[PDB]
Amino acid sequence: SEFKKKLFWRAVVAEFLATTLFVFISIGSALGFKYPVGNNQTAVQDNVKVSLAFGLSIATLAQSVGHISGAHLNPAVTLGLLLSCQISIFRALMYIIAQCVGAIVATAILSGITSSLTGNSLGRNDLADGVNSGQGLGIEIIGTLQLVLCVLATTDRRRRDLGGSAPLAIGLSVALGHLLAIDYTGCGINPARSFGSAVITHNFSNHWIFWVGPFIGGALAVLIYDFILAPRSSDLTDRVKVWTSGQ
Amino acid sequence: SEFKKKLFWRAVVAEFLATTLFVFISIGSALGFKYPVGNNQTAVQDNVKVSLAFGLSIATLAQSVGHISGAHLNPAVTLGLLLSCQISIFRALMYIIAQCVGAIVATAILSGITSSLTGNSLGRNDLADGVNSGQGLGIEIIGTLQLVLCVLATTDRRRRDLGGSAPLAIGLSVALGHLLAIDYTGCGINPARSFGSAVITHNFSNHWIFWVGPFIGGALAVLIYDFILAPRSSDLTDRVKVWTSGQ
Amino acid sequence: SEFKKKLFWRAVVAEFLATTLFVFISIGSALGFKYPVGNNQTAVQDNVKVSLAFGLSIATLAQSVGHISGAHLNPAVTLGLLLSCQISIFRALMYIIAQCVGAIVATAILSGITSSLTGNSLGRNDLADGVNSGQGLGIEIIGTLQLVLCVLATTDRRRRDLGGSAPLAIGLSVALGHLLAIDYTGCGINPARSFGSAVITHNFSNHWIFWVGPFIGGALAVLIYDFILAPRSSDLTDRVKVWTSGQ
Amino acid sequence: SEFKKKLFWRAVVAEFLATTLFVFISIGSALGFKYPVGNNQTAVQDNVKVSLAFGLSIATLAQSVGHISGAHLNPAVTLGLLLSCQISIFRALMYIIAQCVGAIVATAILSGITSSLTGNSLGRNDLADGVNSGQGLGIEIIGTLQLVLCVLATTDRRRRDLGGSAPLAIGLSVALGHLLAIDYTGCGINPARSFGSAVITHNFSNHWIFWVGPFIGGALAVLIYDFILAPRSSDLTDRVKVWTSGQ
Ligand SMILES: CC(C)CCC[C@@H](C)[C@H]1CC[C@H]2[C@@H]3CC=C4C[C@@H](O)CC[C@]4(C)[C@H]3CC[C@]12C
Ligand SMILES: CC(C)CCC[C@@H](C)[C@H]1CC[C@H]2[C@@H]3CC=C4C[C@@H](O)CC[C@]4(C)[C@H]3CC[C@]12C
Ligand SMILES: CC(C)CCC[C@@H](C)[C@H]1CC[C@H]2[C@@H]3CC=C4C[C@@H](O)CC[C@]4(C)[C@H]3CC[C@]12C
Numbered sequence: 001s002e003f004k005k006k007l008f009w010r011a012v013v014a015e016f017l018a019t020t021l022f023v024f025i026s027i028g029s030a031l032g033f034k035y036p037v038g039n040n041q042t043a044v045q046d047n048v049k050v051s052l053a054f055g056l057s058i059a060t061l062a063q064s065v066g067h068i069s070g071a072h073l074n075p076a077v078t079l080g081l082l083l084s085c086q087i088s089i090f091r092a093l094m095y096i097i098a099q100c101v102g103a104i105v106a107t108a109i110l111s112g113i114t115s116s117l118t119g120n121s122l123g124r125n126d127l128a129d130g131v132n133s134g135q136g137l138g139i140e141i142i143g144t145l146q147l148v149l150c151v152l153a154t155t156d157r158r159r160r161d162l163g164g165s166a167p168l169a170i171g172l173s174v175a176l177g178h179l180l181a182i183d184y185t186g187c188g189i190n191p192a193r194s195f196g197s198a199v200i201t202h203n204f205s206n207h208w209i210f211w212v213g214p215f216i217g218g219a220l221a222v223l224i225y226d227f228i229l230a231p232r233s234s235d236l237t238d239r240v241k242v243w244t245s246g247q
Numbered sequence: 248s249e250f251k252k253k254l255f256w257r258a259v260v261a262e263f264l265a266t267t268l269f270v271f272i273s274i275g276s277a278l279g280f281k282y283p284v285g286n287n288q289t290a291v292q293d294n295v296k297v298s299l300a301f302g303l304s305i306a307t308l309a310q311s312v313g314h315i316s317g318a319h320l321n322p323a324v325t326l327g328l329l330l331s332c333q334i335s336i337f338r339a340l341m342y343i344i345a346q347c348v349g350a351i352v353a354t355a356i357l358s359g360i361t362s363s364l365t366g367n368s369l370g371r372n373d374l375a376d377g378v379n380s381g382q383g384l385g386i387e388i389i390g391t392l393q394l395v396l397c398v399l400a401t402t403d404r405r406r407r408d409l410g411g412s413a414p415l416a417i418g419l420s421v422a423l424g425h426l427l428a429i430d431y432t433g434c435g436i437n438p439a440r441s442f443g444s445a446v447i448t449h450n451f452s453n454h455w456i457f458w459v460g461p462f463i464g465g466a467l468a469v470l471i472y473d474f475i476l477a478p479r480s481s482d483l484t485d486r487v488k489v490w491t492s493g494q
Numbered sequence: 495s496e497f498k499k500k501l502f503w504r505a506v507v508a509e510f511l512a513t514t515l516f517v518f519i520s521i522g523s524a525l526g527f528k529y530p531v532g533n534n535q536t537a538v539q540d541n542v543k544v545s546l547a548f549g550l551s552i553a554t555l556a557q558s559v560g561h562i563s564g565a566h567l568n569p570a571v572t573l574g575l576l577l578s579c580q581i582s583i584f585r586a587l588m589y590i591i592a593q594c595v596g597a598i599v600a601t602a603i604l605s606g607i608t609s610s611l612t613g614n615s616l617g618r619n620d621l622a623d624g625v626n627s628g629q630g631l632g633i634e635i636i637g638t639l640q641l642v643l644c645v646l647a648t649t650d651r652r653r654r655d656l657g658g659s660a661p662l663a664i665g666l667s668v669a670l671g672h673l674l675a676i677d678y679t680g681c682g683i684n685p686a687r688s689f690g691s692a693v694i695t696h697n698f699s700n701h702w703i704f705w706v707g708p709f710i711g712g713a714l715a716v717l718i719y720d721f722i723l724a725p726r727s728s729d730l731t732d733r734v735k736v737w738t739s740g741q
Numbered sequence: 742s743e744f745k746k747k748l749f750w751r752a753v754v755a756e757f758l759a760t761t762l763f764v765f766i767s768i769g770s771a772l773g774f775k776y777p778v779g780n781n782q783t784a785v786q787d788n789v790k791v792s793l794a795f796g797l798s799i800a801t802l803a804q805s806v807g808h809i810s811g812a813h814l815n816p817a818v819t820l821g822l823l824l825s826c827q828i829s830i831f832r833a834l835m836y837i838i839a840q841c842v843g844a845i846v847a848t849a850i851l852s853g854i855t856s857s858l859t860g861n862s863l864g865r866n867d868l869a870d871g872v873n874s875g876q877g878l879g880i881e882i883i884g885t886l887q888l889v890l891c892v893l894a895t896t897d898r899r900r901r902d903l904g905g906s907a908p909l910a911i912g913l914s915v916a917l918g919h920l921l922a923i924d925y926t927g928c929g930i931n932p933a934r935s936f937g938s939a940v941i942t943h944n945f946s947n948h949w950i951f952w953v954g955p956f957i958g959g960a961l962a963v964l965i966y967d968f969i970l971a972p973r974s975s976d977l978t979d980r981v982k983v984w985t986s987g988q
């Protein structure tokens with residue numbers, strides 16, 4: 001059904017292009033503080049700058065392509081919307097493929113642009129010194145939990161009290177996740193964004209954390225919103241049919 | 248009445264979960280600058296980072312659960328809404344219990360994740376050197392006064408001139424309170440959030456400030472908004488019945 | 495006419511209280527980086543923190559009391575709205591008196607709170623090294639010009655394309671003014687806000703700038719909006735009657 | 742036709758004045774970290790401060806002159822709106838002339854105000870060390886691509902899912918571009934902004950980047966939004982008539 005519709009593939013291309021722009025802008029801001037190359041200064045990474053870069057990139061690209069693709073730009077957000085039965089399995093898989101490919105393309109272009117940097121890690125997510133696998137996993141879980149919870153609540157379609165900009169809300173949620181998680185894990189929070197850096201730098205050490213934790217956080221947010229706090233008066237059988245229908 | 252309504256208990260569970268997420272994300276962001284552990288560096292706390300963490304946490308969680316519970320997430324805001332005769336006594340008590348227990352749970356999990364920090368104060372609010380109990384009390388009073396005043400004016404329901412995101416407004420008020428009070432008192436203003444850190448660290452020195460100042464500030468905000476600036480044309484006899492009925 | 499109305503004096507008290515809260519919170523955030531007092535550290539003032547403090551203070555207080563008083567909180571803004579003939583002369587006079595008194599009271603209370611700071615300037619506005627009277631005057635004129643222009647455009651009442659939060663718009667304008675002018679003059683931008691610090695510290699050197707420049711900027715913004723960009727097709731004789739009628 | 746209309750010339754004057762205010766305030770905030778002059782301190786530029794200055798200046802001036810001129814304030818945005826056939830060729834040319842002249846005027850006044858800085862580059866855009874022409878070109882292309890894409894998607898007039906403040910959305914897009922590109926190229930992103938600095942400082946080294954890259958980014962944004970993501974159901978022949986008609 002969705003395979004033969006041009007609106008679906010425009011949405012997939014929108015996901016690819018917006019993910020590329022998001023990853024490029026955000027990881028470019030994360031690599032900004034290392035410049036100039038020659039100038040030997042005790043340059044310290046600005047966490048507010050990087051968090052605002054990721055968050056405002058999400059806000060701007062959501063404002064740009066929300067009416068076209070839903071402005072997911074995150075495999076965990078897409079999986080959360082899948083488990084809340086809002087999107088089909090095929091749309092979820094195509095969105096995840098598009099997001100990962102767009103992140104890989106953006107990170108390759110960024111490796112080209114930042115070629116003067118020696119030891120260019122391309123913003124690859126890894127555990128800080130003092131944070132082990134479980135602690136970083138919990139960091140990723142909570143960050144993605146708040147993100148997917150905000151995404152689910154913003155698009156309930158039963159809410160008449162909603163006001164203001166939904167893209168701004170999702171962007172500030174991403175920025176909040178970064179303000180939490182940058183000092184602990186670099187704030188993957190987005191499996192495609194971490195996957196692109198891991199692929200380009202050929203380093204997948206502890207990379208399973210940044211795929212497992214965000215998915216657990218998305219599942220927990222789905223459970224919290226759709227089975228504890230704001231349940232829907234609809235049978236699970238009718239909702240599951242969206243997986244094969246997309247309705 | 249409210250005791251036998253499932254929607255009331257959904258709201259209470261929403262307050263518990265959202266306060267847990269708020270405390271965890273905000274204090275974990277406040278503890279970020281102490282990482283890495285092995286790296287001997289004279290790192291300083293970035294106050295904008297922590298203020299934005301608290302503010303955007305409040306804004307995001309308000310967007311998530313405000314239509315479910317009102318998203319108080321602050322015993323001062325709950326007491327202000329009780330004193331403005333908008334909620335019942337039972338709802339206020341259940342909200343305060345849920346917020347405090349959720350804060351304790353979040354701080355326990357956070358001390359679990361940040362166990363590598365030696366002498367971890369877990370974001371416990373304490374007076375800065377040069378500030379006595381009275382000065383920190385005044386700072387807390389003013390921060391809570393502005394926060395509760397913004398909450399009361401945002402939910403007036405007699406206003407048609409409101410626009411934009413009310414969760415964003417309340418979050419930016421929380422961030423304003425933090426931009427004020429982080430340097431002076433570690434920025435409490437939320438008695439549950441202070442209480443969780445005090446319980447986990449087993450340290451209650453000067454803890455009366457962060458329960459008295461927020462309550463005085465909330466009560467003063469109620470007085471200002473309901474009996475100086477925006478009086479209601481209702482007898483107090485009708486408004487008192489909201490305490491026992493919850494209407 | 496307005497002398498014998500309860501709503502008029504409620505608005506005046508709202509202006510007084512909101513100016514008190516604004517001056518207190520913002521200047522207290524400006525002084526925060528000096529704490530702890532005992533610790534001998536070369537901490538540097540964070541311009542983003544102070545600018546966000548002023549801006550979020552204006553935004554929060556506008557969201558609180560704009561429906562009551564209009565949330566001017568600035569003698570330059572009040573003078574601009576008088577020259578654009580939106581308020582009466584008596585309302586402008588009482589608003590400016592209330593704003594100055596509130597700033598004086600807030601600065602007194604904050605000086606009481608920040609007594610342990612030796613050589614405390616209380617955020618007194620003065621020129622930096624390398625900036626003479628003319629350059630600081632120009633910076634103040636431009637900052638207040640953009641502030642008053644935003645206020646005039648946001649309250650046009652002929653506009654149907656206005657969206658989002660007007661208090662947030664005015665607050666971000668104030669934050670922008672501080673981002674421009676903190677390094678040059680400390681960003682007076684607000685004659686009452688500087689007048690309070692000058693009165694409490696008993697230092698009026700170069701203080702004519704912060705009462706001349708903001709008023710010039712307000713008058714220029716009135717000229718730009720009401721006579722160049724979006725003129726009103728109403729007689730100047732008719733708009734004169736607003737000064738003595740308020741309608 | 743449009744040459745003799747009062748509203749057209751009001752829009753042109755609004756573009757000139759708002760571009761003057763934008764350039765002045767943003768580049769004044771950019772040069773502020775070098776003050777005080779006498780104090781010998783190793784001051785480091787705050788990228789968040791300058792990025793927020795640019796973005797909030799764009800948001801405030803859009804809120805001020807959007808209903809009069811559309812608030813481009815950027816030759817790349819004007820070129821994008823021309824190529825998407827939203828304005829005429831005459832309007833676009835007059836807008837670009839006004840923006841360049843306003844940037845020149847603002848930079849001249851600012852060099853008058855920042856005269857005490859020795860070797861004052863007036864925030865002139867140039868490549869950082871480690872960045873050659875291709876890398877800076879790519880950075881400028883991507884930043885302007887995201888900006889123009891956000892502008893095109895925001896002013897669509899076919900969308901009913903838009904909420905919040907469009908000026909704030911465009912301002913956050915500008916701030917995001919600066920957060921990305923300040924460390925690499927100073928974030929031209931705006932050919933008029935770079936042009937004024939280059940003209941006043943009499944230095945055009947690599948100045949072609951900040952005219953070509955923004956225009957390439959705007960053209961790519963127009964291509965992406967109009968012929969990949971959200972095509973319009975009209976013939977190109979009908980849309981071309983806007984170039985000579987303005988309707
Ligand atoms: C909020 C919940 C549901 C998600 C996060 C919980 C998990 C991932 C976290 C939170 C608390 C964590 C534990 C807390 C304390 C310690 C002791 C330390 O010496 C080794 C790791 C260990 C054993 C942590 C492992 C991972 C852990 C269990
Ligand atoms: C809105 C109100 C209730 C909050 C602020 C008022 C209170 C808490 C503040 C404002 C004035 C303050 C006092 C002002 C001056 C001093 C002198 C100093 O050597 C010791 C502290 C002391 C005695 C302060 C204690 C705290 C204080 C009383
Ligand atoms: C648009 C206008 C009205 C706003 C600001 C303009 C005024 C206040 C500013 C801008 C340019 C400034 C001048 C620029 C250069 C100098 C040389 C310096 O050695 C003494 C001050 C003096 C003479 C400045 C005085 C103040 C000045 C005239």
Ligand SMILES: CC(C)CCC[C@@H](C)[C@H]1CC[C@H]2[C@@H]3CC=C4C[C@@H](O)CC[C@]4(C)[C@H]3CC[C@]12C
Binds near residue numbers: 876879882
């Ligand atoms: C995505 C598009 C629209 C914008 C960015 C693409 C262009 C401008 C980028 C992408 C790849 C880049 C190249 C990657 C690698 C190199 C080798 C290096 O030693 C010099 C720069 C140079 C030659 C770069 C020049 C700029 C470049 C061609």
